[PDB]
Amino acid sequence: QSTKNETALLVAKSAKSALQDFNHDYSKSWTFGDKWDNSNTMFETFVNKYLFPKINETLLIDIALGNRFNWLAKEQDFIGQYSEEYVIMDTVPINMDLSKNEELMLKRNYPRMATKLYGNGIVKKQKFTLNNNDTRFNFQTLADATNYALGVYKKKISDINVLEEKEMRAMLVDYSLNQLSETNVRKATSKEDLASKVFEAILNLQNNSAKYNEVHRASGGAIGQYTTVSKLKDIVILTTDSLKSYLLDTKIANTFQIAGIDFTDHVISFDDLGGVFKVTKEFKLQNQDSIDFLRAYGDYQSQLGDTIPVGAVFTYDVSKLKEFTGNVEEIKPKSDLYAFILDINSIKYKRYTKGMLKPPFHNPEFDEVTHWIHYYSFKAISPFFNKILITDQ
Amino acid sequence: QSTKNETALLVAKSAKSALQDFNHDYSKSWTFGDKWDNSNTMFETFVNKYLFPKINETLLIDIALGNRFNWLAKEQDFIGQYSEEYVIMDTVPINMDLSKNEELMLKRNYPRMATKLYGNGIVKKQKFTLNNNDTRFNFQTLADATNYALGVYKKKISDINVLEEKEMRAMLVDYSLNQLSETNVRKATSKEDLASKVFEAILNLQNNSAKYNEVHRASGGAIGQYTTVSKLKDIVILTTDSLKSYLLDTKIANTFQIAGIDFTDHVISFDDLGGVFKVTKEFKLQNQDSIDFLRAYGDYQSQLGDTIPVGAVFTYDVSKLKEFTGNVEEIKPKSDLYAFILDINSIKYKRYTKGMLKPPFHNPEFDEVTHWIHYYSFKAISPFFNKILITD
């Protein structure tokens, strides 16, 4: 449309704006003044129609986003780069008989030590820039500006939690789809069949059995056995929301909840598992639209001509762009009737949050300081605990 | 030399690692683990063949590397640039000729002189960047990483000191070869000959000799003479190590009346006193492996296309590169039979080390701290004192 309004022509006059005084090295110096009228438009009160509209309140809505797996995070000292782990293999007790060679008292019996070696994590970062001259134009108190500068920082803390939660629930799905042996994998047919298999596979744990760990794919655990038990306070089911709303909707969940464990809190569920995408073919970045799309999510450092290695993760939806298609697949469970019953001690997860507030670079040319948040996060998954995958594949 | 061992193929996979995670903008973000087997490897033990091997001990040799020239250092102010010194040249007496006219009294005989304008020195610079991200992937103790961060810093001063003595040694040898007279040079024939021509070159520096200095290379002294003596408490003999070793094991160890004629208190010595290079013909940089060889010695600021002036000094073995052959000559005597017997206080050496440890720059984008070390060193040789070269 179009409006021949006296106020709207003053509002839409873009040559008077504050942006004209900050995108030109010479600009206006003195202000004449403006005739503001609220007649036959919006912002019109019944009394005193010539005053500029005034703000009742401004409200920074800050939601404290939380990493669901924060209680698993150990803290190391960020020294060295290889963590390894090892168990002792089973040696079942044998009967004694008093009619032997009796020099077998001299004989040896060593422990057997299945191990596995783990690499490193990666150091992740993010930055934000707060200035001192232009962003003061729209807060009208000092307190709102300080709350803004604080809420930007707390948002930079909360999206670390979002990143780590989505990253670990990508890890646990990529594991169960592409790494796990087909001995832990039970196969269902329908939804109630899968529910009965989940409820009998919870009870398949708490048993001294050597069947449910992948100790055969440890480094030295091929021959022999390794017996694992697990309590109920460290069993976590990872599944979908559409299937948590059916597992909890059974009488067995009621008798689990009554006089016992919080079964609503042991079943960790999401809408569909995976918004995280991997890389299968080593490509490069060519298009400026993809660069602007990566800038929209805070990825400031990547430019044209940068290459992406096979195995890189993204944590957001990338796959609609012109050169990611074909090279980028999704960590998503096939045939979404899906449940991965793990022991929560199998998630080897530790961080290094010591000194994650690096001192700011001031940049006094534009008077815009910048804070960086560096942290080290190691994500792995151990073979020495009970795991069961239940799918239709 | 091909290996199908599973642990060797596990190590040979360069795609898994600290390197590809730190080169790219996105990378893998978890680790499934690797089956490490010590069997049939260098890392094999007999009781447990499935662990990664261990370090108990990590050393870092530290050597301090002194200077052998810093009694000549005069701590100056570093203000202004042009210094200047002069002497008044000699005028011999003439005869009283009474036949000349009486207005010879009114003509002025001005005293003539010879100066030498020096100029500035060289602000010298080196830096080092210590990392907080990837240096800590080594150094299995925090104390080892702090020892490393201190050992780098203590190495920087050590190769300031050895650099300053290489430059002083090169200044004295390059001055002995190029800028001298015909009177100053001698020709020895062997080592037993040079060990006595040094002994008779002392007792020549301390006569009233208009020669043995180089005031003809001063500003006003092209025509005329200037006589200078020495005191033998000021004479420096600069030789190789072979000459001093030969003195101490043969001439001092095979004479009876040694009680007066020992000059080895005044002898500075070097094992091999040519290792420093110059420039001729004014090349520039165009090859990749040349600046790759320059990066190994700490020179970070050279890019391709940077031009090198006609008198620059390279101080390490540099003449084997593709560009520098024919344009770069070595400051060395051609015989390994060499003695430069010069008067001290002819070597001015004024370095400036006050604002030397400049405050760091923490670079938190890469989480690193760069430290700089700056000093101003002026070294020069006055042409107004007695010098003798003995060589081949």
Partner: peptide, 27 residues
Amino acid sequence: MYEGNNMRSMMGTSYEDSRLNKRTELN
């Protein structure tokens, strides 16, 4: 193990690690 000039400028204090102040928000 040897101190020498131990507490030098900011990196020699950065390895003797500093400021465990901020952590993440659930637990």
